[PDB]
Amino acid sequence: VISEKVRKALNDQLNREIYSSYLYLSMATYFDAEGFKGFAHWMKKQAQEELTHAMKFYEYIYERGGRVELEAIEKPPSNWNGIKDAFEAALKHEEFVTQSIYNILELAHEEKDHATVSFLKWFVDEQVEEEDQVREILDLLEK
Amino acid sequence: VISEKVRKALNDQLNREIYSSYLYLSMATYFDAEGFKGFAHWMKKQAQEELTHAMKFYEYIYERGGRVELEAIEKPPSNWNGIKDAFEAALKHEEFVTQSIYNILELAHEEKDHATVSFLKWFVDEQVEEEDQVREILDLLEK
Ligand SMILES: [Fe+3]
Ligand SMILES: [Fe+3]
Numbered sequence: 001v002i003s004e005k006v007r008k009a010l011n012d013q014l015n016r017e018i019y020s021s022y023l024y025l026s027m028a029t030y031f032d033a034e035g036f037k038g039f040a041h042w043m044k045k046q047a048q049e050e051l052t053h054a055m056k057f058y059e060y061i062y063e064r065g066g067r068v069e070l071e072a073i074e075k076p077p078s079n080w081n082g083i084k085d086a087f088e089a090a091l092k093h094e095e096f097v098t099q100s101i102y103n104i105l106e107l108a109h110e111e112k113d114h115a116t117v118s119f120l121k122w123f124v125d126e127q128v129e130e131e132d133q134v135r136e137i138l139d140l141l142e143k
Numbered sequence: 144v145i146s147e148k149v150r151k152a153l154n155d156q157l158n159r160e161i162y163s164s165y166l167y168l169s170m171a172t173y174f175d176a177e178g179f180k181g182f183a184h185w186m187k188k189q190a191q192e193e194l195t196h197a198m199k200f201y202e203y204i205y206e207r208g209g210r211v212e213l214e215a216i217e218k219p220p221s222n223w224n225g226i227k228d229a230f231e232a233a234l235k236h237e238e239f240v241t242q243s244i245y246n247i248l249e250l251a252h253e254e255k256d257h258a259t260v261s262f263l264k265w266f267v268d269e270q271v272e273e274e275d276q277v278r279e280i281l282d283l284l285e286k
Contacts, residue, residue: 022213026213
């Protein structure tokens with residue numbers, strides 16, 4: 001059974017994964033308004049993946065005996081200053097999500113919640129791999 | 144090309160479909176907290192379908208030359224007074240969404256936007272069919 005503090009942190013993170021999904025969809029609305037279908041398609045796939053991650057948090061919280069409480073989702077930005085600007089914002093957001101998950105990892109270690117440490121490690125690795133992909137796109141577009 | 148008024152209404156409706164998806168997911172969190180897996184599974188599938196509907200609005204808006212602006216999503220209720228209460232709330236929400244779409248239908252007729260009338264008619268039929276399914280579940284649970 002999860003402690004209340006870890007359940008709160010996981011529930012907070014689930015709502016952060018939903019906002020991440022929503023932000024990427026918003027980036028797609030910007031790319032699609034400019035006619036960058038291919039970049040918009042990449043953002044829509046990332047929005048789908050973040051939602052899938054959110055539902056993995058969902059099912060894990062219920063497996064460990066907690067429940068989910070859904071919070072308001074803030075309005076994301078809807079415009080950026082070009083392609084590179086949007087992907088730099090995505091990279092910055094991914095680094096924020098990685099830091100968020102790393103903070104839960106430290107809390108789980110403190111309460112010796114080894115199942116939560118194992119659960120979260122998959123998401124750190126997927127985030128760094130997503131950061132690497134965005135860095136590759138930025139590198140490709142250089143100058 | 145869509146008029147600004149119809150584009151605004153479709154964009155408003157897209158955000159209403161996202162909130163609908165979010166409300167059904169919230170109903171699933173309530174059912175799952177009580178251990179009603181089967182009812183929670185039904186709500187998660189409805190949440191997925193509403194999101195699919197939202198993305199059909201998304202792609203239609205861009206086909207007709209508009210863009211999408213994503214708005215804040217309000218926090219849904221997270222608790223109901225039993226199974227019947229949750230499904231009555233779903234029925235009431237579906238009737239609200241049907242009325243919303245019917246109002247766009249009238250606006251599209253007024254501007255003789257026959258493509259939008261055709262686009263929307265599929266969603267009215269799917270909503271009435273969803274209302275029928277919720278009424279059947281309510282009928283099944285009677286007394
Ligand atoms: Fe993620
Ligand atoms: Fe719908």
